[PDB]
């Protein structure tokens, strides 16, 4: 996350902008009515 | 004659019910509780120990501590046993710490002897700080453990009938008409059943041929098949139903096809749907349907189909639907032409991170070759995690009168969109397209509007023109 010190073209006000980069976020990925468990028990729905 | 025999059979089949898929959920459960109690356990220890270093100067130093002493505290209740349910009650002993105010002391418990298990009663081992002396110290080490139920894991039975066939046979004699109608139905374990229906007669209707049958398979599963098929002079009905589990996959097909034999009005429809699940469930769905329409004495003819096909994928990747449908259709009336004819494609799209849906329609038509043109009446829409845009409604039109003088009118929107972006707003909107006619010049309009903001740079256009019989108006208005 950076600053930046700017004189925008669209504004004459001089301004600082805070500007937090793009970011991709990696969501692991996981198991559905095969076996279900998370962390707390784990449920076997196939034997179900 | 009729006969409605029943060789009776009440016997059953008893499949036991494997509950022991719980008996180790529960088990899991327990394990969380354990572990979450080792955790609270080092919570209260944190503090337990500042609590020891504070009271240690108050008790053991000061004098503050045994005087007028009382016994420590010890309840014991005696066993019993109940020998109409069968259970032997094991004695229970609850210890308090008599020093202080009630605070608890070790106990220890076994579990009570039962006759089957609907429940387990809970043996723990409860070790606690015990104020008889001023030392506080609590056994993170050693967490509560109850024991796991095990009610009877595989006691229960799933019943599977023995019955014996079931049978009815119906039957009648006469001249003009014979009817013989008979069903049976199989019971043994699994389901088969067959109806035969034989109806003869002088009349040519009242002759016909109907059968069925039904299976249905339960040994792995329930897998059903289910065929159908009529023999009727006017009515040609054939139906295909057949659900089958593999005892891992979902398999669903519908194949139903039959048409209509009337003169006047012949007619043909046809199913298919074809729902299936190896890993991601897939799904067809194409339904056809053809009509054809001839009235002589109203000397009104038509024929078309309506016909649609939906496909559907939930993926896990992502999920798209996709639909669209044709109604088709032409005719005559009174020696003029029925004319109409309607088409969409409707496209929906879905994802984390974009979703998109964007839906056409044509719903051209006319009716005696007046009036004609529907069209366009289209929208498009886009949302990502980026940007919104949206397209709404440009739309073309342009209806012809053929009496009279031929009046025109088409009046409809112009395209007009809306883009957002960060740090930029952006709306542009053209609108009011017209048709001009007679009857002094019917109007023709039209309207441009123009927004785009970047917060000091604000930039505004607006535009109006109106046309009309002799005269006509512009305005214009500009802000920059």
């Known amino acids: 996350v950076l600053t930046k010190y700017s004189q925008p073209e669209d504004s004459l006000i001089p301004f600082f902008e805070i500007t937090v980069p793009e970011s991709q976020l990696t969501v692991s990925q996981f198991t559905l009515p095969k076996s279900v468990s998370d962390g707390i028990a784990a449920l076997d729905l196939n034997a179900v | 004659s009729v006969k409605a025999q029943y060789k009776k ?33 080092n919570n209260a220890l944190d503090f337990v120990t500042k609590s020891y270093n504070e009271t240690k100067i108050k008790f053991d130093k000061y004098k503050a501590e045994k005087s007028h ?36 002391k070790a106990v220890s418990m076994p579990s009570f002897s039962i006759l089957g298990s609907d429940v387990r009663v809970p043996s723990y081992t409860l070790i606690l700080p015990s104020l008889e002396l001023p030392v506080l110290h609590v056994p993170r080490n050693l967490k509560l453990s109850l024991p796991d139920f095990k009610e009877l894991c595989t006691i229960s039975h799933i019943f599977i009938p023995a019955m014996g066939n079931i049978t009815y046979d119906f ?28 109806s003869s007669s002088v009349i040519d209707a009242l002759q016909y041929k109907l059968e069925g049958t039904t299976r249905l398979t339960r040994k792995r599963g329930l897998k059903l098949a289910t065929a159908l098929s009529l023999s009727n002079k006017f009515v040609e009905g054939s139906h295909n139903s057949t659900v089958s589990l593999t005892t891992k996959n979902m398999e669903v097909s519908v194949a139903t ?8 009005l012949r007619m043909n429809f046809k199913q298919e749907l074809n729902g299936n699940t190896k890993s991601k469930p897939t799904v067809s769905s194409s339904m056809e349907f053809k009509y054809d329409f001839n009235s002589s004495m109203l000397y009104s003819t038509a024929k078309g189909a309506v016909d649609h096909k939906l496909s559907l994928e939930s993926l896990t990747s992502y999920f798209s639907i996709e639909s669209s449908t044709k109604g088709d259709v032409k005719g005559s009336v009174l020696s003029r032409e029925y004319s109409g004819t309607i088409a969409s494609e409707a496209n929906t799209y879905l994802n984390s991170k974009s979703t998109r849906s964007s839906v056409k329609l044509q719903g051209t038509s006319k009716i005696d070759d007046i009036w004609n043109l529907e069209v366009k009446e289209n929208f498009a829409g886009e949302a990502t995690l980026q940007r919104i845009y949206s397209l709404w409604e440009h739309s073309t039109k342009n209806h012809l009168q053929l009496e009279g003088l031929f009046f025109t009118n088409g009046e409809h929107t112009s395209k007009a969109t809306l883009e957002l972006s960060p740090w930029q707003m952006s709306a542009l909107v053209q609108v009011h397209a017209s048709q ?23 930039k505004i256009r607006w535009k109006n023109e109106v046309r009309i019989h002799s005269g006509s108006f512009q305005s214009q208005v500009e802000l920059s």
């Open chain 2, 436 to 458: 001009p006619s007679s009857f002094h010049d019917f109007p023709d309009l039209g309207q441009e509007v123009a927004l785009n903001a970047n917060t000091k740079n604000q």
């Open chain 2, 257 to 264: 096809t039959t048409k209509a034999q009337i003169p006047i």
């Open chain 2, 9 to 41: 059979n009440k016997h059953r089949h008893s499949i036991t019910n494997p509950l022991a898929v719980l008996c180790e959920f529960i088990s899991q459960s327990i394990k969380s509780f354990d572990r979450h109690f080792e955790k609270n356990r």
């Open chain 2, 69 to 104: 002493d009382e016994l420590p505290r010890t309840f014991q209740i005696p066993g019993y046993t109940v020998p109409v349910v069968n259970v032997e009650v094991s004695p229970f002993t609850i210890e308090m710490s008599a020093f202080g105010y009630v605070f608890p």
């Open chain 2, 171 to 198: 039957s009648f004699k006469s001249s003009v008409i014979t009817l013989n109608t008979n069903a049976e139905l199989f019971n043994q374990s699994d389901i088969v059943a067959h109806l035969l229906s034989s």
